């Protein structure tokens, strides 16, 4: 259960405030690459960055309204299902104002050709770039981005009722943000659908990403953290 939850009594404005307060820091790469990259040094940077991002993603998840009302069991399942989708929406968000490039970190901005270094990486970079460009075109606002990141967390393991009540509250919040920005009812419903449809592309990139991370594992190119090995195991 999650009956009586504070998360359902929140206003849209209070839900946005809670979500903004929860935000993880923007991480730097603890290493600059020597140019050029190998398969091993690229995957090393991304895997290292991802491992550091996961630690903060865990603290974020706990400050997401409704999340901590779940059993520790269900909390584990949702993060296990969502974590790469969450890293990915973050990447495409930070990359919006960097046309043709992926801002992995302020000191790790790559274009698609540096993607070629690793085998099968270029196709996913292109999908990430396209998603980033779609956000840029739609002028995705910070308040909308934190709502979507929360939907991904709550949504990506629900079939993979309280979770439904919290997702409904997050939908009310997005429409609030859109009403407030001066969008007609018609424009609101159309923007909501457009943002949510992008989540199915983010799910897609996450599933391909995971196939790739499991290829890379088998290859033994780069060591993965225990935490990262558990997350992979969760998706077989």
């Amino acid at each position: 259960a999650g009956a009586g939850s504070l998360a359902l009594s929140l206003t849209a404005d209070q839900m946005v405030s809670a979500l903004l307060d929860a935000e993880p820091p923007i991480l730097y790469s603890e290493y600059d690459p020597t140019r050029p990259f190998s398969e091993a040094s690229m995957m090393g940077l991304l895997t290292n960055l991802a491992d550091r991002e996961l630690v903060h993603m865990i603290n974020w998840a706990k400050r997401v309204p409704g999340f901590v009302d779940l059993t520790l069991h269900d909390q584990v399942h949702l993060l296990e299902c969502a974590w790469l989708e969450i890293l990915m929406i973050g990447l495409v968000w930070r990359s919006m104002e960097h046309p043709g490039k992926l801002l992995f970190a302020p000191n790790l901005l790559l274009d698609r050709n540096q993607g070629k270094c690793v085998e099968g990486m270029v196709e996913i970079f292109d999908m990430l770039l396209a998603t980033s460009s779609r956000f840029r075109m739609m002028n995705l606002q910070g308040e909308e981005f934190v709502c979507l990141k929360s939907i991904i967390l709550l949504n990506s393991g629900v079939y993979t009722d309280h979770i439904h009540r919290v997702l409904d509250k997050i939908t009310d919040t997005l429409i609030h943000l859109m009403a407030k920005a001066g969008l007609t009812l018609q424009q609101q419903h159309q923007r909501l659908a457009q943002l949510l449809l992008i989540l199915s592309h983010i799910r897609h990139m996450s599933n391909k990403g995971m196939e790739h991370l499991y290829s890379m594992k088998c290859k033994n190119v780069v060591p993965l953290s225990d935490l990262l090995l558990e997350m992979l195991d969760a998706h077989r």
């Binding site: 630690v55 865990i58 998840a61 520790l72 584990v76 993060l79 296990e80 935490l227 558990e230």
Partner: peptide
Amino acid sequence: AILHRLLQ
């Protein structure tokens, strides 16, 4: 199970 320990 690391995530269980970090989430608690």
